[PDB]
Amino acid sequence: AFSAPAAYLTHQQKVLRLYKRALRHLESWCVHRDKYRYFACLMRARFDEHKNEKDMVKATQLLRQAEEEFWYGQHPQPYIFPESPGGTSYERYECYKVPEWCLDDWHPSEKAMYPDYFAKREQWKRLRRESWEREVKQLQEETPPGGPRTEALPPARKEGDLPPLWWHIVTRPRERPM
Amino acid sequence: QQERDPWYDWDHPDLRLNWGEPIHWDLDMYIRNRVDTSPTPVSWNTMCKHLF
Amino acid sequence: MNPFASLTLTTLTILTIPIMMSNSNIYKTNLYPNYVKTTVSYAFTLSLVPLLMFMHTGQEMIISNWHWMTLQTVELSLSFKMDYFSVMFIPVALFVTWSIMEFSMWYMHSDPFINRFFKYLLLFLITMMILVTANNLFQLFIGWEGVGIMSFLLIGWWHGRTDANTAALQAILYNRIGDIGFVLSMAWFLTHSNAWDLQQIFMLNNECPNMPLIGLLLAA
Amino acid sequence: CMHAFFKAMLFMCSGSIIHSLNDEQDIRKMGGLYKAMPFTTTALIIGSLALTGMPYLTGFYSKDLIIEAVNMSYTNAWALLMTLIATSLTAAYSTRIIFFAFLGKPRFPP
Amino acid sequence: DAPPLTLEAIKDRVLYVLKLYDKIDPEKLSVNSHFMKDLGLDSLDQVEIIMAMEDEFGFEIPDIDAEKLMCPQEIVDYIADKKDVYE
Amino acid sequence: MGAHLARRYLGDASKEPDPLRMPTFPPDYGFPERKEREMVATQQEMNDAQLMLQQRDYCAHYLIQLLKCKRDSFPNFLACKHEQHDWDYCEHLDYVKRMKEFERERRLLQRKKRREQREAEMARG
Amino acid sequence: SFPKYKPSRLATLPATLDPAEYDISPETRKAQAERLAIRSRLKREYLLQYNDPNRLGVIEDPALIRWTYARSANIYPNFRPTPKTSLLGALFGIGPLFFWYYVFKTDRDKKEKLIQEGKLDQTFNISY
Amino acid sequence: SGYTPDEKLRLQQLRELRRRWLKDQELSPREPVLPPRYKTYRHSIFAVTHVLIPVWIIHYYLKYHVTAKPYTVVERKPRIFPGDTILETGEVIPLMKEFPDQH
Amino acid sequence: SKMELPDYKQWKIEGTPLETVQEKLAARGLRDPWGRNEAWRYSGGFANNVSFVGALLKGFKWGFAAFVVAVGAEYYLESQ
Amino acid sequence: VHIEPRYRQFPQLTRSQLIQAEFFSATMWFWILWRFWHDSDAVLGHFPYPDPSQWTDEELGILPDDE
Ligand SMILES: CCCCCCCC/C=C/CCCCCCCC(=O)OC[C@H](COP(=O)(O)OCCN)OC(=O)CCCCCCC/C=C/CCCCCCCC
Ligand SMILES: *P(=O)(O)OCC(C)(C)[C@H](O)C(=O)NCCC(=O)NCCSC(=O)CCCCCCCCCCCCC
Question: Which residues cross the membrane (chain C) (predicted)?
Answer without folding.
Answer: 6-27, 39-58, 84-105, 117-134, 140-160, 172-191
